[PDB]
Amino acid sequence: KNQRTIVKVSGLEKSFHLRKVLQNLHFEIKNGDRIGLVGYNGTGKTTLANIIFGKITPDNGLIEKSRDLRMGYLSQSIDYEVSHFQQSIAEVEEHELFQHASSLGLNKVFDWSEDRLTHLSGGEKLKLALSMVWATKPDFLILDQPTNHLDFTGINWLVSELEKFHGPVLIISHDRHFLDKTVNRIFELEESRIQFFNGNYSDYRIEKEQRIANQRHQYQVQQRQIEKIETQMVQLKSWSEKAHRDSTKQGSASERRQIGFKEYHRVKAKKLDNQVKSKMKRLQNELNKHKLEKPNEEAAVRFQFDSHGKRGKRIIEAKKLTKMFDDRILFQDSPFYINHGDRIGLLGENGCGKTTLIKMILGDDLSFVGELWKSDSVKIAYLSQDVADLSADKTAIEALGFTDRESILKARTLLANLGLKEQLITKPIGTLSLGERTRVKLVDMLMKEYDVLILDQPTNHLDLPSREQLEQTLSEFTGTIITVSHDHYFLNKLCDRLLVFENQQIKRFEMKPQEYLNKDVKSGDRSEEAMLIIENKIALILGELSLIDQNNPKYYRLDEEFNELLKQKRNLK
Amino acid sequence: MRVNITLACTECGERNYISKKNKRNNPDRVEFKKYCPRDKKSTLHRETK
RNA sequence: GGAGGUAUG
RNA sequence: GCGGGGUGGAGCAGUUCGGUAGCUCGUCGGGCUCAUAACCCGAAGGUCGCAGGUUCAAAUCCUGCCCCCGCAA
RNA sequence: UGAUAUUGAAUGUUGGUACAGCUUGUACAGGAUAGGUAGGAGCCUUGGAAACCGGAGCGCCAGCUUCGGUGGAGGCAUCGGUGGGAUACUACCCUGGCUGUAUUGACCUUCUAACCCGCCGCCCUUAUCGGGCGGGGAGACAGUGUCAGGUGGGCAGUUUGACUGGGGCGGUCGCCUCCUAAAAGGUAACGGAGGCGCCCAAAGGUUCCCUCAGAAUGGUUGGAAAUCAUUCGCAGAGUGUAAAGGCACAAGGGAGCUUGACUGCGAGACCUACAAGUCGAGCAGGGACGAAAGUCGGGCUUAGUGAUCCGGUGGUUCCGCAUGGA
RNA sequence: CUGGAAGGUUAAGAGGAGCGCUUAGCGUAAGCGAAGGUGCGAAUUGAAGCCCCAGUAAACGGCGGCCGUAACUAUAACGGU
RNA sequence: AAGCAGAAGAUGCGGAGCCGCAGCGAAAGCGAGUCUGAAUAGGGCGCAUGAGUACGUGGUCGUAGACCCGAAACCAGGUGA
RNA sequence: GUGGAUCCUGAGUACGGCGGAACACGUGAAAUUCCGUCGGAAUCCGGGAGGACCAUCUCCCAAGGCUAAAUACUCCCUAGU
RNA sequence: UCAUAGGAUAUGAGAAGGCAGACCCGGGGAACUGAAACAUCUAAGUACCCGGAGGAAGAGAAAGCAAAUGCGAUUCCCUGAGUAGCGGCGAGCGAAACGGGAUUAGCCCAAACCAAGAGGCUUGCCUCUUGGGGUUGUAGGACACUCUGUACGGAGUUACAAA
Ligand SMILES: Nc1ncnc2c1ncn2[C@@H]1O[C@H](COP(=O)(O)OP(=O)(O)OP(=O)(O)O)[C@@H](O)[C@H]1O
Ligand SMILES: Nc1ncnc2c1ncn2[C@@H]1O[C@H](COP(=O)(O)OP(=O)(O)OP(=O)(O)O)[C@@H](O)[C@H]1O
Ligand SMILES: [K+]
Ligand SMILES: [K+]
Ligand SMILES: [Mg+2]
Ligand SMILES: [Mg+2]
Ligand SMILES: [Mg+2]
Ligand SMILES: [Mg+2]
Ligand SMILES: [Mg+2]
Ligand SMILES: [Mg+2]
Ligand SMILES: [Mg+2]
Ligand SMILES: [Mg+2]
Ligand SMILES: [Zn+2]
């Protein structure tokens, strides 16, 4: 309709205990704004959103919004909204909701039992949560951490739909690529102060670099000035002291006794002092007028999956493996194996059973048909897709469960390296940000003395420093890694082999995630052999012709063959 | 860290009392039964936001 | 078949 | 007396704000070479000048003590 | 440097507003490109149905769209099924895009009559001024007025500490404790020592109970020193935080319940140039603990703070510039 | 100082979403409240400068530390940081 | 008091106005009380424990150069090559 | 003197924004008056003021002019103290 | 080109300059000084410069003061009152109305409308120019109605016409 300001925040302050989260934020959300709220873990992005939505009252400041404004809020605790889906059927026009749902890939949601509706994939929860919000016809969309668990399908859907949406959208995400398609403005929340950037997220990154560079340069210039003046002052002082010290010891005995001798020299000393006092006063005044604070020194997340010793070849084998739920076959007669050092990417749409298989491998799910052999000597660390596993009441130490001082020191030290300090450690996990909760789960993995790493969606709820550090570490890890991620970049960097869930079958492919997708059917693979050999002959003859003058008798023979071979190429195509 | 607070009566709202608390030790809004001069009786006073 | 020119030891 | 320095062998960060002790060169072992260098592959070497406190955790914070360098002396 | 006045005309481009028209609408299934709602069984039809062709836009590559030429009688539906929803047609509307009407600016060029000419020619006029006329150039700018931002030692008005064995440097500046201090109080020096700019939701109140440090001896890990057990043992401990003064009918340690770390006050005192500072029985209101007496207006006592003016906030039987409000 | 190009920051002036006061009226009261008036007023728009990027030193200006090494020694042509 | 009559006078007229007899409170207001306060309580300021006013002399103070003399300067308008 | 059909009753004015000034009143809650610049009413069913502003009431009718006396001062003249 | 500018002649008790070192109304307008410094502020709209004047000047006949069974131009004196207020609410600055007095005095236009005349014909309209008319507020006037005077009588050169 227009671009009238819909949400206006001014002087928004919010603190928790002694930790300032939001400090004096002034911003406006207008109609049609597609704003990416970015920032590392614990920076306050969810806190901010909840204040915008009204779940949390701020300490100071005003939030201006149309009294009738309907705000669709995707939230982070989907579990609560999805558990109320049964209640939502009665409150929302069934028609619209189910129309969306089918597009998102949740087919025939009507028929799902309350069991399945309580056992959903985390990707299904999100797809169901998304469909619900959009059926409510909100005027303002807030999407906290979307595309976390979505597959290629749900990402294409969420993009095409966001573009269509009429109202403004605030997207809280760490996913560079999702932002680079949907947003035109970035809100970067750092040190409790929001900075504004125009465009998508990639350019934000670039522009942020330049701002840091400019800020760093300017701070250094000021420091050089300060040091220059302090060097001056030191030099002038020394001189002043020497002047006073020598005021009485100059010239011969008689000349020292001259009247007013030391007063003359001491007057000179006093002038040097005045210079120091003036230099000092001016320096102090200048700093008060303009004193740049040292630019933020971004903390460096550091954690390493210490390599274990040598073990044996086989670690997992499956024969005629079949898993059912009541009458639904997830996968049937699926044989696969995993050897030591394999980097396996689990590929498949949401609901295809990736997390199911992992629970079977771990031994939490024994209800399957066939043989699934796992080496008894395999110690597995396991980052679980379901963040809600940890009771959100225990403190960090209680969740780790270590009681001896040595184990506690390792756990606390690792937590500190991951940016969780004493303050956060003593707090109930329920208070930690969703990425802080994930850094707590990681420490429980690092403290295990293991041989295999199962990473189920390891890139959700993780900021650039943590994701980058994880990527570096996992590339070095010599053990077996099994990772489920719909971030194909992360998979393509880490995984060299694939288990694909297709048509209720698990097939192992000996290729990288990127190659599998870009494959091209082998319908004429018995003929590509011909097209390959003939074309390679064309290259050889073409190469030689490039080096020979047309006047050489050898030219004639090569040209005839070239034209003849080209006819063959046409015939094969 | 340790800040001044005002306790308002929860019946009449009057900010009858001021005191201090350490925010790390007692982050939540404190409550105290104290005499409210307006209501002429002891009433629960809660720290103002 | 032969001439002329166009790193350390 | 008044200031500044003591981090593997050398030169240097990190210290304010406690969270795996590091960068460059060098040394040592094994390759390449007829042999040396360069080059390639591994490793050792400081618990942060010393001795105690504080802390789950100290190069970093506190207490004393010993060296080095500037002046005055 | 910008807005605005002097300051006009025409064109083109591009946004917003209102109206009108062209129209525009593909999840899957379903016969397929199903926008929403309403009526809906007839509607259209030589006033040209279907079908053929050409043209054009869109397009998810299925296809729909309409200007049309051939064409001449059907074509479409409620029924049927599908699906979430039904197909014709009509009524009222939305999404998106497009055109036009009328406005709205911003911008683009161009123009001439404002303004400008330290250009030329003629006249006033023997005149390198001025003015008039006619060309030319420039032109809605410039110049000037009002307003605004930036720059601005070019210029101007001023500021730039006290104590002090001269001044300067260094140190100090307010508050608490001790010594100097000469056995009341007070008492200086750039005299000798240190601390403070808080901390506690219990480390406060009350009720009840209770002793500490150290040593010897005996004891698994156990070590000079962890935990026990006996004897001796005035404080040799502790008392949040310096020092002094106190404290073992504890002011030190533990436990139960609570918020008196209350409201209005206050006889009378200490200290004191003033401004301030300190102590206070007792009275009233309403409470905590206790069986009751009774204790409780913070902490063992003494530091942990800043006048007025000026602003912010909450309350209010106050005032409200004729009157009611504000 | 000079030259840039977008962008960020910025004034007056344009804009006037909204909110307060007032009261015809509605109401048993409490209170709500049209129009008009009036006190404030946000979005949007709005230049240079500054930020940013290059160049310029017969522009203003600036022009370093520590360690090791040569067949007497001593110094280092040489090397490290 | 101004002012009007009158020797530049005394004086007559002139009661507007001023001070005092009532205080307390920021104020509404109440009144030998009043303010604070829930309070016939306590306390503050008052009353009961009372003299003011007009004029003159003297002491001191305020505003005026204000006990007298004294800068270097500042500013305004002029006079001088 | 009686009429209330119609008409007239001071326009770039009153007033407003911006920048200043004068009002005892230093922009302040700032009425009232004046200036530069820009904008800009009603006009009798009308208009202004009563210290922001609104409503009610009360009092006046701006944007044209003239108007003596009471008042200020004395270089000079006369008579005097 | 008509014209106009310009030029010539005649006619003018027209202006010019001075001062009384004062008083009056305006245009411009300090600083020292006070604030125990100093910038807002003060000194002060003072000193000074300039213009206009007159014996006086300025103001003046309610878009006023007020809040009463109201007042009735302006000016000046007393008082209000060092009050209300203003103010780095600092130094300082500082009213007005009511009340008592001196002195008193009120008037004239613009517009509606009438008559005349003229030019633009803008073409039965308009503008300009003369005289009449008219001057105010719980409205007045024009315009209609009556009554009345036309000097019997009133005023006047200090406004209300002018010697
Ligand atoms: N209710 C709360 N109480 C206390 N601390 C909180 C509370 N909510 C958040 N925090 C802490 O304050 C900061 C705010 O976290 P928040 O959830 O807002 O961040 P975020 O931007 O959403 O981060 P993430 O992407 O990791 O989820 C974090 O330190 C979080 O631990
Ligand atoms: N107990 C159960 N009963 C019925 N259906 C179940 C049960 N558990 C899971 N499902 C369904 O079966 C599929 C298994 O989901 P699961 O979480 O195991 O795998 P996924 O979808 O591959 O994982 P991801 O959460 O990583 O996307 C999903 O459709 C889930 O809804
Ligand atoms: K100067
Ligand atoms: K001269
Ligand atoms: Mg010398
Ligand atoms: Mg899963
Ligand atoms: Mg979060
Ligand atoms: Mg001065
Ligand atoms: Mg001195
Ligand atoms: Mg001395
Ligand atoms: Mg004594
Ligand atoms: Mg002074
Ligand atoms: Zn109460």
Coordinates of N, CA, C and O (backbone and C1' of nucleotides) in Angstrom, one line a residue, chain E residues 248-285:
Chain E
rA248 P 32.1 -9.2 78.0 O5' 32.4 -10.7 77.6 C5' 31.3 -11.4 76.9 C4' 31.4 -12.9 77.2 C3' 32.0 -13.3 78.5 O3' 31.4 -14.5 79.0 C1' 33.1 -14.3 76.6
rC249 P 30.1 -14.3 79.9 O5' 28.9 -13.8 78.9 C5' 28.1 -12.7 79.2 C4' 27.0 -13.2 80.2 C3' 25.6 -13.1 79.6 O3' 25.3 -14.2 78.8 C1' 25.6 -12.1 81.7
rA250 P 24.6 -14.0 77.3 O5' 25.9 -13.4 76.5 C5' 25.7 -12.8 75.3 C4' 26.7 -11.7 75.0 C3' 26.8 -11.2 73.6 O3' 25.9 -10.2 73.4 C1' 29.0 -11.6 74.6
rA251 P 25.2 -10.0 71.9 O5' 26.2 -9.1 71.1 C5' 25.9 -8.7 69.8 C4' 27.2 -8.2 69.1 C3' 28.4 -9.2 69.2 O3' 29.2 -9.0 68.0 C1' 28.9 -7.2 70.3
rG252 P 28.8 -10.0 66.7 O5' 29.8 -11.2 66.9 C5' 31.2 -11.1 66.5 C4' 31.9 -12.4 66.9 C3' 31.2 -13.7 66.4 O3' 31.4 -14.0 65.1 C1' 31.8 -13.9 68.7
rG253 P 30.3 -14.5 64.1 O5' 30.0 -16.0 64.6 C5' 30.9 -17.0 64.4 C4' 30.4 -18.4 64.8 C3' 29.0 -18.7 64.3 O3' 28.9 -19.1 63.0 C1' 29.1 -19.1 66.6
rG254 P 27.6 -19.0 62.1 O5' 26.6 -20.0 62.8 C5' 26.8 -21.4 62.8 C4' 25.7 -22.2 63.4 C3' 24.3 -21.8 63.0 O3' 23.9 -22.5 61.7 C1' 24.3 -21.9 65.3
rA255 P 22.7 -22.0 60.9 O5' 21.4 -22.3 61.8 C5' 21.0 -23.6 61.9 C4' 19.7 -23.7 62.8 C3' 18.5 -22.9 62.3 O3' 17.8 -23.6 61.3 C1' 18.9 -22.5 64.6
rG256 P 16.7 -22.8 60.4 O5' 15.5 -22.4 61.4 C5' 14.6 -23.4 61.9 C4' 13.5 -22.8 62.6 C3' 12.7 -21.7 61.9 O3' 11.8 -22.2 61.0 C1' 13.2 -21.1 64.1
rC257 P 11.4 -21.4 59.6 O5' 10.6 -20.1 60.2 C5' 9.3 -20.3 60.8 C4' 8.8 -19.0 61.4 C3' 8.8 -17.8 60.4 O3' 7.6 -17.8 59.6 C1' 9.8 -17.2 62.4
rU258 P 7.4 -16.6 58.6 O5' 7.1 -15.3 59.5 C5' 6.9 -14.0 58.9 C4' 7.7 -13.0 59.6 C3' 8.2 -11.8 58.8 O3' 7.2 -10.8 58.8 C1' 10.0 -12.6 60.2
rU259 P 7.0 -9.8 57.5 O5' 8.2 -8.7 57.8 C5' 8.1 -7.8 58.9 C4' 9.2 -6.8 58.9 C3' 9.1 -5.8 57.7 O3' 9.7 -4.6 58.1 C1' 11.1 -7.1 57.5
rG260 P 8.9 -3.5 58.9 O5' 9.9 -3.0 60.0 C5' 11.1 -2.3 59.6 C4' 12.1 -2.2 60.8 C3' 12.4 -3.5 61.4 O3' 13.8 -3.4 61.9 C1' 11.4 -2.1 63.0
rA261 P 15.0 -3.9 61.0 O5' 15.1 -2.7 59.9 C5' 15.7 -1.5 60.3 C4' 16.0 -0.6 59.1 C3' 14.8 -0.5 58.1 O3' 14.7 0.8 57.6 C1' 16.7 -1.4 57.0
rC262 P 13.3 1.3 57.1 O5' 12.8 2.3 58.3 C5' 12.0 1.7 59.3 C4' 10.6 1.6 59.0 C3' 9.8 2.9 59.1 O3' 9.9 3.7 57.9 C1' 8.6 1.2 60.1
rU263 P 9.9 5.3 57.9 O5' 8.3 5.6 58.2 C5' 7.4 5.8 57.1 C4' 6.1 6.4 57.6 C3' 6.3 7.7 58.4 O3' 6.5 8.9 57.7 C1' 4.8 6.2 59.6
rG264 P 7.3 10.1 58.3 O5' 6.3 10.7 59.4 C5' 5.1 11.3 59.0 C4' 4.3 11.7 60.2 C3' 4.9 12.6 61.2 O3' 4.9 14.0 60.8 C1' 3.9 10.9 62.4
rC265 P 6.3 14.8 60.4 O5' 6.8 15.2 61.9 C5' 7.5 14.3 62.7 C4' 7.0 14.2 64.1 C3' 7.8 14.8 65.2 O3' 7.6 16.2 65.2 C1' 7.0 12.7 65.9
rG266 P 8.7 17.2 65.8 O5' 9.0 16.5 67.2 C5' 8.1 16.7 68.3 C4' 8.7 16.0 69.6 C3' 10.1 16.4 70.0 O3' 10.0 17.6 70.8 C1' 9.9 14.1 69.9
rA267 P 11.4 18.2 71.4 O5' 11.2 17.9 73.0 C5' 10.0 18.3 73.7 C4' 10.1 18.0 75.1 C3' 11.4 18.5 75.8 O3' 11.4 19.9 76.2 C1' 11.0 16.2 76.4
rG268 P 12.4 20.9 75.7 O5' 13.8 20.3 76.3 C5' 13.9 20.0 77.6 C4' 15.0 19.0 77.8 C3' 16.4 19.4 77.4 O3' 17.1 20.3 78.3 C1' 16.0 17.2 76.6
rA269 P 18.4 21.0 77.8 O5' 19.5 19.9 78.0 C5' 20.8 20.1 77.5 C4' 21.4 18.7 77.2 C3' 22.6 18.7 76.3 O3' 23.8 19.1 77.0 C1' 21.1 17.1 75.5
rC270 P 24.8 20.2 76.4 O5' 25.8 19.5 75.5 C5' 26.4 18.3 75.9 C4' 26.9 17.5 74.8 C3' 27.8 18.2 73.8 O3' 29.2 18.3 74.2 C1' 26.2 16.9 72.6
rC271 P 29.9 19.7 74.1 O5' 30.1 19.9 72.5 C5' 30.9 18.9 71.8 C4' 30.6 19.1 70.3 C3' 30.9 20.5 69.8 O3' 32.2 20.8 69.6 C1' 28.9 19.6 68.9
rU272 P 32.8 22.3 69.8 O5' 32.0 23.1 68.6 C5' 32.2 22.8 67.3 C4' 31.2 23.5 66.4 C3' 31.1 25.0 66.5 O3' 32.0 25.6 65.7 C1' 28.9 24.0 66.7
rA273 P 32.5 27.1 66.1 O5' 31.3 28.1 65.7 C5' 31.0 29.2 66.5 C4' 30.4 30.3 65.6 C3' 29.2 29.9 64.8 O3' 28.0 29.8 65.5 C1' 30.7 31.2 63.5
rC274 P 27.0 28.6 65.2 O5' 26.4 28.9 63.7 C5' 25.7 30.1 63.4 C4' 25.5 30.3 61.9 C3' 24.9 29.2 61.2 O3' 23.5 29.2 61.2 C1' 26.9 29.8 60.1
rA275 P 22.6 27.9 61.1 O5' 23.0 27.2 59.8 C5' 22.6 27.8 58.5 C4' 23.2 27.0 57.4 C3' 23.0 25.5 57.4 O3' 21.7 25.2 56.9 C1' 25.2 25.9 57.0
rA276 P 20.9 24.0 57.5 O5' 21.6 22.7 57.0 C5' 21.9 21.6 57.8 C4' 23.3 21.0 57.6 C3' 23.6 19.7 58.4 O3' 23.2 18.6 57.7 C1' 25.3 21.3 58.8
rG277 P 22.4 17.4 58.5 O5' 23.6 16.8 59.4 C5' 24.8 16.4 58.9 C4' 25.8 16.0 60.0 C3' 25.2 15.1 61.1 O3' 25.1 13.7 60.7 C1' 26.4 16.9 62.1
rU278 P 23.9 12.8 61.3 O5' 24.3 12.7 62.8 C5' 25.5 12.1 63.2 C4' 25.6 12.2 64.7 C3' 24.5 11.5 65.5 O3' 24.6 10.1 65.6 C1' 25.1 13.6 66.5
rC279 P 23.3 9.3 65.7 O5' 22.8 9.4 67.2 C5' 23.7 9.0 68.2 C4' 23.2 9.4 69.6 C3' 21.8 9.0 69.9 O3' 21.6 7.7 70.2 C1' 22.2 11.2 70.6
rG280 P 20.1 7.0 70.0 O5' 19.2 7.7 70.9 C5' 19.4 7.7 72.3 C4' 18.4 8.6 73.1 C3' 17.0 8.4 72.8 O3' 16.4 7.4 73.6 C1' 17.5 10.7 72.6
rA281 P 15.5 6.3 73.0 O5' 14.5 5.9 74.2 C5' 15.0 5.6 75.5 C4' 14.4 6.4 76.6 C3' 12.9 6.4 76.7 O3' 12.4 5.2 77.4 C1' 13.6 8.6 76.7
rG282 P 11.1 4.4 76.8 O5' 10.0 5.5 76.7 C5' 9.5 6.2 77.8 C4' 8.6 7.4 77.5 C3' 7.5 7.1 76.5 O3' 6.4 6.5 77.1 C1' 8.7 9.0 75.7
rC283 P 5.4 5.6 76.2 O5' 4.6 6.7 75.3 C5' 3.8 7.7 75.9 C4' 3.2 8.6 74.9 C3' 2.5 7.9 73.8 O3' 1.2 7.4 74.2 C1' 3.8 9.5 72.8
rA284 P 0.7 6.0 73.7 O5' 0.2 6.3 72.2 C5' -0.9 7.2 71.9 C4' -1.0 7.5 70.5 C3' -1.1 6.3 69.5 O3' -2.4 5.8 69.5 C1' 0.5 7.9 68.7
rG285 P -2.7 4.3 69.1 O5' -2.3 4.3 67.5 C5' -3.1 4.9 66.6 C4' -2.6 4.7 65.2 C3' -2.4 3.3 64.8 O3' -3.6 2.6 64.4 C1' -0.5 4.5 64.2

